[PDB]
Amino acid sequence: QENHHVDYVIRFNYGDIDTPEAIKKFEVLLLELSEVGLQTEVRQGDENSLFVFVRAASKKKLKRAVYQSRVRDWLYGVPQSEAERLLVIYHLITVPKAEGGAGITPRHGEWKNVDAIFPLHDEETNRQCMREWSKKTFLSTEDLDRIRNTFGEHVGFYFAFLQSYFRFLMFPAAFGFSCWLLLGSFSIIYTVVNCLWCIVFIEYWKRQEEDLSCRWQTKGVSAVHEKRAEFKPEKEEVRGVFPATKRMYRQLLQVPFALLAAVALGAIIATCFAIEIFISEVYNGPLKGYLVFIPTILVSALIPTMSAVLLTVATKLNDYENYETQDAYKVALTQKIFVVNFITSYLPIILTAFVYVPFASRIVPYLDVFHSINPDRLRKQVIYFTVTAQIVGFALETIDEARFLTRVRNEAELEDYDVTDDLREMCIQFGYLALFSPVWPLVPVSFLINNWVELRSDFFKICVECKRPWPQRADTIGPWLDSLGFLSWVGSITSSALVYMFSNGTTIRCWALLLTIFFSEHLYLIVRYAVRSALAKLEPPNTRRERIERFMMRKRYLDTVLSPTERFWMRQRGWKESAEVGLSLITKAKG
Amino acid sequence: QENHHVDYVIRFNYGDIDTPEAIKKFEVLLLELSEVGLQTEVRQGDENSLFVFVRAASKKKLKRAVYQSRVRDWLYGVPQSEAERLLVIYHLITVPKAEGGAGITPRHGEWKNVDAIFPLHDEETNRQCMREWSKKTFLSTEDLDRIRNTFGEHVGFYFAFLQSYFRFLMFPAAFGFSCWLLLGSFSIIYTVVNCLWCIVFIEYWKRQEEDLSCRWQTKGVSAVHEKRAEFKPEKEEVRGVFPATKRMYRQLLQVPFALLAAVALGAIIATCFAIEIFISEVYNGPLKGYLVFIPTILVSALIPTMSAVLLTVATKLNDYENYETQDAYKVALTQKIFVVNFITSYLPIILTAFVYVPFASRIVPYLDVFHSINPDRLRKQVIYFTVTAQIVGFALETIDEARFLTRVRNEAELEDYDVTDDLREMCIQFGYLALFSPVWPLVPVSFLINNWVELRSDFFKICVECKRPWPQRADTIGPWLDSLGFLSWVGSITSSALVYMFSNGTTIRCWALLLTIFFSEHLYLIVRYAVRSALAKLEPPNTRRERIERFMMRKRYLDTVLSPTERFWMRQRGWKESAEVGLSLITKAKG
């Protein structure tokens, strides 16, 4: 065994505080970790901090911790290889000591000296599993089980989702390559099939999630976990509270932030249009096409940086709103990231599809300061916003114990893994497919090539580039599925407006634009209901097995358990007297 | 005790079959009822049928039946005064004998001779409770508990729903009387408040249902019950099946039935319009107004009869589709009754609001065979369709053991109670409020007067006019709540189209009609989401009490339960050695 039976290693800083407080905090830390059933070995690894090591002290204490974790589990209503054995020890460290034990928050409150705690990689399993499916291009269910046993299943749902999305992506890739050689752009045949794919993928992954969360034993996780909330009073079985009206008021800061960000990006896009008209009039290039579209390509390449800036602003605003639980914090964060994603990514194309193309005759005289807008302008917007941001990234890509501790010190300085920074890009790609893929039908091919190139890069990052996350116990990919549903809904309006407005070359005839919007959205809702109710009747195998197991358990437990006025109830004291009375009555009445 | 401890009385016919088979069926009936723990006394009550009486044989058998019913309950995951004590005996009679016992289906299969089984009324409780709140006009929670202990809670949810609907109805009554003296008809102020009321009532009753089903102990009832399905094969733990594709095909008979019913009622309404134009041209009356609108009032009074005819056709079509469970049967029946309700009730007003008023100049020359259509024509349509159908009904309304058995024989010939025939009328009233109440704002007053007149008539009918239903264990009012939600959604489009088309007197300007439809529907969805998410944070008392009880039970049960490589884990065998090693390391590093 490479790791010397180490489960978790707990980093403990001392450089902030002075000397004689650090020994008191260290003594109460080790006293908590030994009061709960954990063994501890401290040896320093950093110049500024020494980290302790934590394993299960004995088999009886480990079985007690496993039984307590299972009791909290099946009271809330929700060992194995490594996920269960590391999850019960992370609960043993972190769970707030009214239950479970030892109540260690990572760095926030009363525990500001201890830094992040983290398990250790198993480099044999990681290297063999990384080089095993370097030539597979499609993982299997046993393979997702091998990524579930390590890393937990919060990683398992993310990897299963990315593999299922990559498998469903090659139907619009083949279709939008077939509908590009044959029948051009802005086509009803491609638009109806694209909206059907956007419905079917979400309504199929919503079923695959239930199947996968019945296969793995994490069926329903609504066990909410507290976080570093800053309570002002102490209401009273005591708990710190925070009123729902001050959070309501603080949540109204999202409206001026989103309005000002939309106004600023509209100013940037209008500046780019003005510079484009300037280089269109003033001759500046022998090729003249790529040089007249220089600022669009520059801002399309620069959009990830301003998106990351707005992500840090939204993260600080989300920390200001002071959520009590972690589920509501993640929901609010995903909503703010969705708003920033919309404003940054789809507004430079909505702003030129519905404002600048049709109103070119009234905005070109307003933007031609210091003295021909086709739908090809919109098609080149979609090209430069779904191609160049990845072309630029690829072009920047091409250009004794002394051996164990020196890799523990190397793992302790790595960064921390997240799912959201790699799943936001999935949400952006699905928005580009849902909203205005009928403009240029090679958007699914341009996304399939990028996903096929960066297929194993996320697994490489989760193995060797960042430290191992503690095995979480997720049930869904999160609120991103609700974001995908909303994004498909907006796409069924946007794509059907664009197809009416730009196919076959005049007068827009609004009495027909709004009728197309109305009928296409209310056809989307009906088709989504039909696909959802059809897929709810086809049952995947890993939930049928659990339903059959639960029915057999119920049937066995039920087969175990089963194996004055009174002058009325004395005439027929049994069965045979009632039978002969009925015999006499039928013979008398039928005779 | 008036009823001589009789729980259920089981009617058994013999006039269909001959003599010597009836004694065999009677003997196996009494053998089943005595094999399960029930006492039986048979005495004849009809000329054509003799019915047995059923009570619990002993206290040990009654406690065994109660424990078996509770075991099936809390295995499916879902005594008292009369509801529990009669429910366990109805399960003891009916439950299909693989569990529970005695497997008696009422009249369908293998048991065609036995007619409907039924409990007996308690006339003291019924008369005292009927004359107690003859002067109350608003029932209390203890009062709904007294209607829950008798009659079960499938009656309790219906009575609580009708009382809550009557309490919420007097806000649009007072508002539409206030908005009628002041600001006329087709008004935005009344339309926005009417749509807000239609949202708030449904999103408040959806919360009151959870509160009431936590107060009563019927939290989640998804325990599906089989019915008289006609299986063709015997698949194999054996069960008869029916393929989901033959039911799918049989369910496509609803489309030609609804299309032909809509075409027939459109023909009737066009005939009424032609006769109205005929009496408008040919002078026939000194008053001339009521005489020119004679056929509208005649068909508006006749609509309940053709609606009942279409209900029998829809019931036969629903029996043709051969559903396996009773929940899916009730859902499909409620959907067909909703379609018939729409076609019969709101199509004669949609057909004159969106076809005949605006297209009067192109349809009056087509309907004036044998040789002025204002919005007042639409207002008089709404008046004659929401007033005269109840005025006609009110005008037709104004113009030893020998004593116990002679009332058991009287109760055995009564009809059978249902909820659907009195809840369909609620759904029709809510549709008239949701869709086109802005046309004539005294529609809520005309409904409030009718409900206040017929307030206690349903309780009178459930006591003395029909026999007592067995105590069912419902959880919701049913699919009618989903029908009310769909009906409010259609109303937010219809009312906002009518208000644009008919307020302040020309050119319709479609680019504005469809924009009003779009913005009003997507404002309805946002306001419904906001009201639903706001009401999900205000917790009613009877579910907070159950949450506190379950949390205290979990806390008590959790406080009960808690009260080479190895040369690494030998340097510090305990806590004090790790403490002094950490002390030496901090003093060496900080020195």
Author numbering:
A (entry chain A), B (entry chain B): 11 to 88, 101 to 258, 266 to 400, 420 to 447, 489 to 594, 603 to 660, 701 to 728
From the manuscript:
Our results show afTMEM16 thins the membrane to enable scrambling and that an open hydrophilic pathway is not a structural requirement to allow rapid transbilayer movement of lipids.
In contrast, in C14 lipids scrambling in 0 Ca2+ is ~30% of that seen in saturating Ca2+ so that if scrambling requires groove opening, we expect that a significant portion of particles would adopt a Ca2+-free open-groove conformation. Analysis of a C14/0 Ca2+ afTMEM16 dataset yields only classes with a closed groove, Cα r.m.s.d. ~0.9 Å to C18/0 Ca2+, the highest of which reached 3.3 Å average resolution. This suggests that the basal, Ca2+ independent activity is due to closed-groove scrambling. In the three datasets for apo afTMEM16 (C18/0 Ca2+, C14/0 Ca2+ and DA/EA in 0.5 mM Ca2+) we could resolve 4–9 lipids per monomer, all localized near the dimer interface in positions closely resembling those seen in C18/Ca2+ structure, supporting the notion that these lipids interact strongly with the protein. No lipids could be resolved near the closed pathway in these structures. In thinner membranes, closed-groove scrambling is enhanced allowing for lipid transport in the absence of Ca2+.
